[PDB]
């Protein structure tokens, strides 16, 4: 259409509020203060196309997975109301994170004010996905001890709310604070080491490993470290500047690690629920 016509631009001609990764040299959407143009640009090739579609499809995927989870037969759970509330809190974190994410990457080039608003929501979305993932996990892991389950539910909320507060600060979004952001969200996920050591000290080395938690938690910690490393160091576009403008740059690979990391976490807590249903809902040990 003849309306809202635009061409991609090199990094140098971008305004300051859009210059976030100097290794993406060309292919940028120019500043365009039209929500019509920004939403139409989802169907165009530019630095943000992959960022947008990884989390747009990932967002409808967790929404479909969450609806199907809610309509699962109550007969396949031990406590279907509380089990669906803890899984639902995880889905709410995943859907909100992916929604705030693709919305931000879509309306990013609109204006300085709009980009500030959605970057604050984007950041907050990562804290909600991390806090929400702890909820079904603490639930099944401390199924018999309610006091440590509730203490850890408090901790991850206090820390998560502190990440949402710091991710509101204007300096936090500057390119120099990239490794601060990577450390803040990394610390939040890796704070699961505390209830993990508590769980293996209490339950046993054999008991934690046999029930697959140790291997599955090492995988999660790998995706956390590997995901934060790519994001913070801008690999691979740091090594091939100008070659990764459209495909497989750091932020794009990171977006893939978020939807994958949320899927291996879901698969993990979904097995924990299958195990709880196999053994029933009491304590004999």
């Amino acid at each position, epitope marked *: 259409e003849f309306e*809202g016509r635009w061409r991609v631009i090199p990094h140098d001609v971008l305004p300051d509020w859009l210059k976030d990764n100097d290794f993406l040299l060309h292919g940028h959407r120019p500043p365009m*203060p039209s929500f019509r143009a920004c939403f139409k640009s989802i169907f165009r090739i530019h630095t943000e196309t992959g960022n947008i579609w990884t989390h747009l499809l990932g967002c409808v995927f967790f929404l479909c997975l969450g609806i199907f989870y809610m309509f699962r037969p109550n007969i396949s759970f031990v406590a279907p109301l509380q089990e669906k509330v803890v899984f639902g809190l995880f889905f709410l974190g995943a859907i909100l994170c992916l929604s705030f994410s693709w919305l931000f990457h879509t309306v990013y080039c609109h204006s300085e004010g709009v980009s500030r608003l959605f970057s604050k929501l984007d950041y907050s979305g990562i804290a909600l996905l991390i806090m929400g993932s702890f909820v079904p996990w603490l639930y099944y892991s401390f199924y018999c001890n309610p006091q440590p389950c509730f203490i850890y539910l408090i901790v991850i909320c206090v820390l998560g709310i502190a990440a949402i507060i710091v991710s509101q600060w204007d300096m936090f979004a500057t390119p120099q604070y990239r490794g601060v952001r990577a450390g803040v969200f990394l610390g939040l996920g890796l704070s699961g080491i505390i209830p993990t050591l508590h769980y293996v000290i209490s339950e046993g080395f054999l008991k934690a490993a046999t029930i697959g938690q140790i291997g599955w938690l090492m995988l999660m910690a790998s995706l956390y470290i590997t995901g934060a490393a790519l994001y913070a160091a801008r690999i691979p576009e740091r090594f091939f500047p100008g070659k990764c403008d459209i495909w497989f740059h750091s932020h794009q690979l990171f977006h893939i690690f978020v939807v994958a990391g949320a899927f291996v976490h879901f698969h993990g807590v979904s097995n924990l629920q299958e195990f709880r249903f196999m053994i029933g809902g009491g304590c004999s040990e």
Partner: antibody
Amino acid sequence: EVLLQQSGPELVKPGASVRITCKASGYTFTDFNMDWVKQSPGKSLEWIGDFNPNSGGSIYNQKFKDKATFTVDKSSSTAYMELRSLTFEDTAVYYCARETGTAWFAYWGQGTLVTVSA
Amino acid sequence: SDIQMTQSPASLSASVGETVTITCRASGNIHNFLAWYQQKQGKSPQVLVYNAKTLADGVPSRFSGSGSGTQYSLKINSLQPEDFGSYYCQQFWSTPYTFGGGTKLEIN
């Protein structure tokens, strides 16, 4: 610094044709659309059309479709506009103006005055 | 010849230090894809404000763009002697791109 440098003035007979040169420097020529603008004496500005040097595509304002033709010489970083079958109404200053993603014009040529005189 | 740009006033004269406001009205919504230009006598135009409110590189803070939809404005705070010239609005939302008729600003 970016600079758009146009060719000198033309004093031509009616029915003649002119080619306005627009040498573009200080940037990667193919990165931005170049637009042509007319300003009749003591008048406002009229968008003639835009030209894409990378794709080679042009979009003309219907008013000037049969009058203006945009060409390019990518190797020399220059935009061209040929004006056909000149008339007294074509006495105007013609500008090349450069886009930056969208069609707002940060950079402009000094203008070429074309005078159609008999 | 689709979007008509209506500039107002057509001309005005104010003294140095005063504030002026030039308004632009589009015949259709231009989604903030509006730019303002200042043009000096015998010289080529120069961009002041683009994307309705974004102040261009090198332009003084005295110039401010404002507006939305079909009604946009250019405000010149504290007029300076060098502010004399022709002012033009422009829409780049739909082809063909169009300009306002201009505003001649005289400085007393």
